[PDB]
């Protein structure tokens, strides 16, 4: 099951309250496989704490390594249901504008054919 399917809203909110207490400089992000994607693998851990200074292109490099991707394997992130406005956008800005009601920032990843047209 996906994260939201496994945890109730109240449990998600409490997860966020506690984790943000414990990690004063990290953003809580859920990073899951796009439903329908079957080239890229599933992560063993899909709950992340991301240093709050990074930008999206830094995060992409990290998640490609987490997935142990080859260089010839395409990867794209959708953040809160849309493509990233820009790879240079700080994750602190992304969190403030795109976070869920529950306090997590949600993303999914996909390969080229699954992701489709990029504009």
């Amino acid at each position: 099951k996906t994260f939201k399917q496994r945890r109730t809203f109240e449990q998600r909110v409490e997860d966020v309250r506690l984790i943000r207490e414990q990690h004063p400089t990290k953003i809580p992000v859920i990073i899951e496989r796009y439903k329908g994607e079957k080239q890229l693998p599933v992560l063993d851990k899909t709950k992340f704490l991301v240093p709050d200074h990074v930008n999206m292109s830094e995060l992409i490099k990290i998640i490609r390594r987490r997935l142990q991707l080859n260089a010839n394997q395409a990867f794209f992130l959708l953040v809160n249901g849309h493509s990233m406005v820009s790879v240079s956008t700080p994750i602190s800005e992304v969190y403030e504008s795109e976070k869920d009601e529950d306090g997590f920032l949600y993303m999914v990843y996909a390969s080229q054919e699954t992701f489709g047209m990029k504009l």
Binding site: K26, F48, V54
Partner: peptide, 12 residues
């Protein structure tokens, strides 16, 4: 899948 994966600066 309940434990968080912590990204650190030593990775950047």
């Amino acid at each position: 899948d309940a434990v968080f994966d912590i990204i650190t600066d030593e990775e950047l």
